[PDB]
Amino acid sequence: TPDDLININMQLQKADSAVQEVTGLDIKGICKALYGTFSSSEKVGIVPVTSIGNFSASLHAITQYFGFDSFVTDMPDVSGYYEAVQNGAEIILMADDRTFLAHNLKNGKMANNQPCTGIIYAEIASRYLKADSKDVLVVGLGKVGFPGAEHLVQKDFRVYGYDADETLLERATSNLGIIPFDPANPKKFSIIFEATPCANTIPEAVLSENCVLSTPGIPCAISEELRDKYEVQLIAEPLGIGTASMLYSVL
Ligand SMILES: NC(=O)c1ccc[n+]([C@@H]2O[C@H](COP(=O)([O-])OP(=O)(O)OC[C@H]3O[C@@H](n4cnc5c(N)ncnc54)[C@H](O)[C@@H]3O)[C@@H](O)[C@H]2O)c1
Ligand SMILES: [Mg+2]
Ligand code: NA
């Protein structure tokens, strides 16, 4: 649909501009430096899977935006997979309800959407040009958040973490060595990474003016009144940034 095609394109463009503002680099630039990898307009076959293919249609527009030679197969599932390989797909892109993967058939590399999304959003946060300290707050330590937190620890940031699930908070503290954040004793941050399927997860007392909030979480961690009040630099996009991360990770 022509209306929806203008919509994702604009949404990706707006997300690109926001990343440029924060880091001085576009999404492509972030990916290339993150993975040390470059694209040659690889052929990517998107196969719809039963688990109406509007998702695969979004993926086509997203991959076209990033310059990939992408196509959606006529058939779904196993028949679609067969079709994709036969039509010379170098990378396979497909998702069920629990896993969204990219598989590079040439080099054997395979990416999972969840760690790839966490890593890139953490990466964008870590590359904030106007950051005044090495302190970073991570809210949400699940499938997306944990790999994000791990990436930040490896990049030598002082990582503060919180998750409403005490078991996951404890396990993140043990394995990663992050400082457990106490909502009862809050401090201000200039860099925040949220990976949570909930709203209003970032307390006001944690925000400083012009701080970066890098969040793949849906819905938004912050109310639009709070982001206006603190002039929050929001990095938030529903699918494209995570997808770019997957593709560049397997090149
Ligand atoms: N934008 C994208 O491209 C993209 C890609 C993948 C996933 N996502 C989204 O990212 C979000 C996280 O995904 P996930 O797979 O990590 O989910 P998950 O369930 O594995 O992890 C979410 C974690 O957040 C915690 N949490 C919930 N409410 C909280 C609160 N108020 N304070 C602190 N912690 C809280 C939960 O305990 C949970 O451990 C989801 O909304 C998902 O839809 C977005
Ligand atoms: Mg995204
Ligand atoms: Na959220």
Give the start-to-end residue ranges of the domains of the chain: 1-112+237-251, 113-236
Q: Which ligand is nearest to the CA of 223?
A: 3
The first and second tokens of residue 76, run together, are 């779904």
Hey, what amino acid is at 249?
S
Ligand 1 atom closest to Cα of residue 117: 5
Q: For ligand 1, atom 9, which residue shows the shortest CA distance?
A: 217
Element (H, E) at 241: helix 240-250
166 marked ligand binding residue: no
The first and second tokens of residue 132, run together, are 């005044």
The CA 195 to ligand 2 mean position distance, Å, reads 11
Q: For ligand 1, atom 19, which residue shows the shortest CA distance?
A: 142
Ligand 1 atom closest to Cα of residue 237: 1
The CB density around residue 191, as the number of other CB atoms within 10 Å, is 27
Q: For ligand 1, atom 39, which residue shows the shortest CA distance?
A: 142
CB half-sphere exposure, 3, CA atoms < 13 A = 0
The CB of 15 under 6 Å from ligand 1? The reply is no
Phi-psi domain of 200 (left: phi exceeds 0; alpha: psi -120 through 50; beta: other): left
Same CATH topology for 1-112+237-251 and 113-236: the answer is: yes
Mutual angle of helices 145-154 and 113-126, in 10-degree steps: 40
CATH number listed for the domain at residues 1-112+237-251: 3.40.50.12150
- CATH among 3.40.50.970, 3.60.150.10, 3.40.50.720, 3.40.50.1100 for 113-236: 3.40.50.720
Q: Which ligand is nearest to the CA of 141?
A: 1
CA gap 170, 243 in Å, rounded: 30
49 marked ligand binding residue: yes
The CB density around residue 150, as the number of other CB atoms within 10 Å, is 21
Residue 215 DSSP one-character state = -
Method underlying the structure: X-ray
Give the residue among 156, 230, 221 at the shortest CA–CA distance from 193. 221
The CA 145 to ligand 3 mean position distance, Å, reads 11
95 marked ligand binding residue: yes
CA gap 79, 243 in Å, rounded: 23
The CA 200 to ligand 3 mean position distance, Å, reads 7
The CA 174 to ligand 1 mean position distance, Å, reads 20
The CA 184 to ligand 2 mean position distance, Å, reads 31
